[PDB]
């Protein structure tokens, strides 16, 4: 019999430009070991495993390897690879990048990502044994802002910026990412009403993310049900200042939630202002 393991992908059925872009980042099968018995996370769509990649020296590099589960049509493969390839264009320390793509003779293509020792940011900050300092939390927010300043300069709109979508590596470098209907409590008022997303709606979301950092990963608007959020915002109501949050940082959050998209600060101005806050907060 022909099993789920024996699937063969017809690359001639993909856009040739996608295949050629993938060519730029191909990882030979003999250079990758996937620890199929060490699942990092598993969804209905895909699964992520621990892996080891051998560099051109022959040294071992810990990585994360993303696969599709059961593949039944070419559009799922196309989507999967197109996502991976968007990351190829990113090169910034606060933006998640791709190590490469492996595709064997049979089976799912494999997207190979750097290993992020401390997982997602929201879980990290909620952990009592990590108990980050207020200073550390501001620092994380500045790193996110720097990654978003980069993305915005490339005209990439994130659409789901939130602490759950940022990851943390062994050097405590924050990498903006997207784990992949609507994240209503992170969305700008105009996006709730029109379902259009811009860099200025990412700024709103970043303000929410900052609030999550400073509350050590509290859920936003816990009292408000997700159908109630638009009314709350229409009345001019906003997330309240977290305990221990410096005043100038809360001022930054409020500015991010200005009802007029064009009066919100740019990521460049957020980087400057948060840098200033970080530099003067001694702790
Ligand atoms: C553009 C684009 C396309 C695709 C992605 C994407 O596929 N990201 C993605 C993210 C996490 C993933 O999962 C893990 C990876 C690692 C690594 N180490 N460790 C420990 C992990 C644990 C998990 C884990 C999964 N579940 N539970 C735990 C994962 F497989 C794929 C992405 O992020 N972007 C993007 C969007 C906007 C940006 F700014 C930059 C990139």
> How buried is 78 (Cβ within 10 angstroms: 0-12 exposed, 13-18 middle, 19+ buried)?
middle
Ligand 1 centroid vs 178 CA: distance in angstroms?
6
Stated resolution in angstroms: 1.8
Question: Any idea which residue has 């906003």 for tokens?
Answer: 238
Given ligand 1 and candidates 18, 42, 46, 48, which is best to mutate, with the most ligand atoms within 8 Å of its CB? 48
Atom of ligand 1 nearest to the CA of 83: 3
Gap between the Cα atoms of 146 and 194, Å rounded: 28
Q: Which long-range contacts (CB under 8 A, 24 or more apart) does 176-184 make?
A: 176/94, 176/95, 176/96, 176/144, 176/147, 176/148, 176/151, 177/95, 177/96, 179/120, 180/45, 180/83, 184/226, 184/229
Q: Which CATH class is domain 116-283?
A: mainly alpha
Our CA angle for 34, 35, 41, nearest 5°, is: 100
In this structure, the strands spanning 60-68 and 100-102 are unpaired
Gap between the Cα atoms of 95 and 87, Å rounded: 9
Neighbours of 16 (CB within 10 A): 9
| Alpha-carbon distances of 153 from 83, 203, 270, rounded to whole Å | 19, 13, 14
For ligand 1, say whether the CB of 149 is within 6 Å of any of its atoms.
Answer: no
Q: Phi/psi zone of residue 221: left (φ > 0), alpha (ψ -120 to 50 degrees), beta?
A: left
The 3-state secondary structure of 157-214 reads CCCCCCHHHEEECCCCCEEECCCCCCCHHHCCHHHHHHCCCCHHHHHHHHHHHHHHHH
Helix then strand count (H, E) for the chain reads 9, 7
| Alpha-carbon distances of 210 from 74, 89, 98, 118, 217, rounded to whole Å | 39, 26, 26, 19, 10
Q: Which of 263, 117, 132 is nearest to 189 (CA)?
A: 263
Instruction: Tell me if the domain spanning 1-115 has CATH number 3.30.200.20.
Output: yes
Give residue limits of the domains in the chain.
1-115, 116-283
Size (the chain), residues:
283
89 an active-site residue?
no
For ligand 1, say whether the CB of 179 is within 6 Å of any of its atoms.
Answer: yes
């Amino acid at each position: 019999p022909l099993l789920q393991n024996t699937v063969h992908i017809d690359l001639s059925a993909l856009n040739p430009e996608l295949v050629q872009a993938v060519q730029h980042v191909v990882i030979g099968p003999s250079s990758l070991i996937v620890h199929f018995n060490e699942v990092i996370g598993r969804g209905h769509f895909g699964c992520v495993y621990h892996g080891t990649l051998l560099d051109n020296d022959g040294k071992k590099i810990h990585c994360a390897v993303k696969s599709l589960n059961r593949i039944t049509d070419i559009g799922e493969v196309s989507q999967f690879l197109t996502e991976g390839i968007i990351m190829k264009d990113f090169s910034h320390p606060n933006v998640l990048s791709l190590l490469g793509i492996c595709l064997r003779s049979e089976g799912s293509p494999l997207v190979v990502l750097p290993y992020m020792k401390h997982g997602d940011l929201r879980n990290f900050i909620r952990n009592e044994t990590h108990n980050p300092t207020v200073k550390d939390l501001i620092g994380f927010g500045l790193q996110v802002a720097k990654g978003m300043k980069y993305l915005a300069s490339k005209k990439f709109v994130h659409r789901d910026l939130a602490a759950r979508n940022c990851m943390l590596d062994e050097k405590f470098t924050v990498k903006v990412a997207d784990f992949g209907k609507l994240p209503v409590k992170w969305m700008a008022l105009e996006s709730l009403q029109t379902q259009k997303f811009t860099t200025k709606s990412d700024v709103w979301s970043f303000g929410v993310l900052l609030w999550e950092l400073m509350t050590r990963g509290a859920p936003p608007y816990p009292d408000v049900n997700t159908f109630d959020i638009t009314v709350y915002l229409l009345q001019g109501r906003r997330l309240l200042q977290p305990e221990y949050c410096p005043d100038p940082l809360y001022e930054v959050m409020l500015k991010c939630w200005h009802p007029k998209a064009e009066m919100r600060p740019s990521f460049s101005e957020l980087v400057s202002r948060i840098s200033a806050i970080f530099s003067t907060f001694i702790g």
